[PDB]
A paper describes a structure:
To investigate, representative Group 2 and 3a enzymes RbCuZnSOD (OUV78940) and BbCuZnSOD (OFX46851) were purified recombinantly from E. coli. This yielded zinc metalated proteins with negligible copper as is the case for human SOD1. As the disulfide forms, BbZnSOD transitions from monomers to homodimers indicating BbCuZnSOD forms an E-class homodimer through an interface incorporating the disulfide subloop and that it may follow an autonomous maturation pathway. BbCuZnSOD has a typical eight stranded, anti-parallel, Greek-key β-barrel core structure with two long loops incorporating conserved metal-binding ligands and coordination geometry. The BbCuZnSOD E-class dimer interface area is 747 Å2 comprising N-terminus, C-terminus, and disulfide subloop regions with a PISA score of 1.0 as opposed to 0.2 and 0.3 for human and bovine SOD1, respectively. As a result, loop I adopts a conformation shifted toward the disulfide subloop.
Superoxide dismutases and reductases are deployed almost ubiquitously throughout nature to prevent damage to biological molecules by superoxide. They employ redox-active metal cofactors to catalyze the production of molecular oxygen and hydrogen peroxide from superoxide. Crystal structures of a Bacteroidetes bacterium CuZnSOD portray both prokaryotic and eukaryotic characteristics and propose a mechanism for self-catalyzed disulfide maturation.
Author numbering:
A (entry chain BBB), B (entry chain AAA): 4 to 153
């Protein structure tokens, strides 16, 4: 039937140790994003869906730009002017552990906007939610492909 | 634009070291499957698309069973009686390097049979191409999710 769940295991790019799992679950109000990552420098990291489910490059550049089927500007999750892939920042604690849970009202699992087969990228720096086209989040520290869950 | 290419980076399950990249490219005659893997025990390894793009489990069991949207029997790539996910065996050389190239006439990138967001599983043992429902290929040595390529 209709995909209710997506799963993304992220793997570090060259010179990083960032790992973890992101799950996407259909909720009444949209899609519940739950991320559990480790090996991050403490503080805020850009947390995005990129347009290619291609994590073959050593530095994650194969994932391409932000997933942007609506051809909009880069912004914050709460902005109307955002990429579908703009999931904001994930915060790592003093031990490099990062937990995020929020409800996204734009991401879907079917049709032109479907995130299935796209990539998750975690960035080295904070997404400032304003600078075009990526929020100045800098290098890619981890990459994974979003798959169909059950 | 219609997806012309899919990419799958495989990562080992916990007790293994198997890595590599699999590409799927639309050709005139079907889909060209190209696999380049390393860290395999020499000999033949079951090489399958599984139904869930979920590589979160320690042992790859999260990937579920064979991708089988037609509800058919397990077989060889050349068989009419096969799962969409039945891509046969990949052979590793004496150094653990494995190359496979063949044209698959069943796998597609859109609709009910789409392999996008499904998993690749590499098995410890040979797929015997006959035993139901999995070809008796034994443990899962590597898992990856099939993503959209540029
Ligand atoms: Zn946790
Ligand atoms: Zn990004
Ligand atoms: Zn963006
Ligand atoms: Zn569109
Ligand atoms: Zn299998
Ligand atoms: Zn099968
Ligand atoms: Zn070849
Ligand atoms: Zn069907």
């Amino acid at each position: 039937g209709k995909t209710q769940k997506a799963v993304c295991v992220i793997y570090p790019t060259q010179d990083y140790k960032v790992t973890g799992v992101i799950t996407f679950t259909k909720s009444d109000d949209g899609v519940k994003v739950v991320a559990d990552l480790n090996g991050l420098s403490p503080g805020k990291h850009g947390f995005h869906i990129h347009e290619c489910g291609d994590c073959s490059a050593s530095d994650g550049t194969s994932a391409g730009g932000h997933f942007n089927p609506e051809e909009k500007s880069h912004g914050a999750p709460m902005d109307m002017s955002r990429h579908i892939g703009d999931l904001g920042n994930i915060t790592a604690d003093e031990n490099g552990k990062a937990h995020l849970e929020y409800i996204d009202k734009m991401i879907v699992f079917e049709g032109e906007h479907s995130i299935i087969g796209r990539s998750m990228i975690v960035h080295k720096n904070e997404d400032d939610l304003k600078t075009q086209p990526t929020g100045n989040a800098g290098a890619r520290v981890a990459c994974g492909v979003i798959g169909i869950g059950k």
